[PDB]
Design an enzyme around this catalytic site. Structure first.
Site, mmCIF file in Angstrom:
data_model
loop_
_atom_site.group_PDB
_atom_site.id
_atom_site.type_symbol
_atom_site.label_atom_id
_atom_site.label_comp_id
_atom_site.label_asym_id
_atom_site.label_seq_id
_atom_site.Cartn_x
_atom_site.Cartn_y
_atom_site.Cartn_z
ATOM 1 C CE1 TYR B 67 -2.831 3.205 1.887
ATOM 2 C CE2 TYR B 67 -1.030 3.052 3.460
ATOM 3 C CZ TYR B 67 -2.123 3.727 2.958
ATOM 4 O OH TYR B 67 -2.509 4.935 3.522
ATOM 5 C CG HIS B 70 -0.913 1.126 -5.120
ATOM 6 N ND1 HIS B 70 -1.427 2.100 -5.954
ATOM 7 C CD2 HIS B 70 -1.433 -0.046 -5.551
ATOM 8 C CE1 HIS B 70 -2.214 1.538 -6.851
ATOM 9 N NE2 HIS B 70 -2.234 0.235 -6.631
#
Ligand code: 4MX
Ligand code: 4MX
Lengths: 96, 96
Positions: B67, B70
């Site tokens: 995450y 990302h």
């Protein structure tokens, strides 16, 4: 409503003591009507010196007061307040 | 694993901006595989000057990195980082 506690223990407090502290706090759910659920955990990332998080569920903000003045909560504080160095408290309704 | 964000907005940020900020952040779940769920809320008690809490669910600590790197999360930060004055981050597994 979630009642969120963020805390740091004093350096002298041992791991066993911390375990006992949370075990006792979790068991308050059984004693205090207003407390519906409790989870807790230890931060692993250490990005920030708070180390522990406690999440407590209530039906409403109103009933948090019922918990606050409850002899079992007062009693918990009377036994364990020397354990924590710092804490933060938040009350909020989780939403999207 | 829960990824917990505690934050304060800068004084210049308006309520509408805050709403847009959280709406956009919540919608990242649809874009970022590692993000499973998001809730957020505003502290009502003001006992402590953090005002907002965001709870993000991940399968494991490992996937939090997925995450973090990302492009959609990097992009979110690139657009909105001027909004916050202070924040705290915690990663933990909720337990009893
Ligand atoms: C695991 C920490 C339990 C005690 C937290 C606490 C400490 C205090 O000094 C005052 C409070 O109102 C509260 C609370 O609202 O729960
Ligand atoms: C609603 C706040 C979203 C961005 C929070 C954030 C800010 C930052 O500067 C560095 C980070 O690693 C994170 C995060 O882990 O999510």
């Amino acid at each position: 409503v979630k009642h969120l506690i963020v805390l740091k223990f004093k350096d002298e407090i041992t791991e066993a003591q911390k375990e006992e502290f949370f075990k006792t706090y979790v068991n308050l759910v059984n004693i205090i009507p207003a407390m519906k659920d409790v989870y807790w955990g230890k931060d692993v990332t250490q990005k920030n010196g708070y180390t522990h998080i406690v999440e407590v569920t209530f039906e409403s903000v109103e009933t948090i007061q019922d918990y606050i003045i409850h002899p079992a909560h007062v009693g918990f504080g009377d036994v364990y307040r020397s354990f924590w160095e710092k804490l933060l408290i938040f009350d909020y309704t989780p939403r999207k």
